[PDB]
């Protein structure tokens, strides 16, 4: 299927354990997608203080379109250095490995895949 539902753990950025996916624009993107698919993928909701916290390149999900059965569409954006890889709409979050952290919410989204 071109769109998946996934139900992400939204994370405190304190909490999370593994900062980021990798060391490359692309090995993030290749990462998020993996840990994505294999239901080990966090959200951390972007606010003052959160993104110097969390390890370069990043990877988003932004809103692809204006949210069948309650999940939002959204893509994979990565930045490195104030570029970003990919053009899409508003930041829901930033993406992290999952490791067992506790949640404080559920983030319904329709990945683009």
Same mark, same amino acid.
């Given at each position: 299927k071109t769109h998946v539902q996934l139900s992400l753990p939204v994370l405190q950025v304190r909490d999370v354990?593994?900062? +980021?996916? +990798?060391?490359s624009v692309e090995e993030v993107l290749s990462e998020a997608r993996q840990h994505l698919k294999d239901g080990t993928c966090g959200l951390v909701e972007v606010e003052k203080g959160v993104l110097p916290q969390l390890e370069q390149p990043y990877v988003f999900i932004k809103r692809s379109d204006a949210a069948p059965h309650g999940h939002v569409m959204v893509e994979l954006v990565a930045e490195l250095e104030g570029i970003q890889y990919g053009r899409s709409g508003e930041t829901l979050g930033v993406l992290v490995p999952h490791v067992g952290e506790i949640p404080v919410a559920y983030r319904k989204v329709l990945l683009r895949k």
């Open positions: 354990l593994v900062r +980021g996916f +990798g060391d």
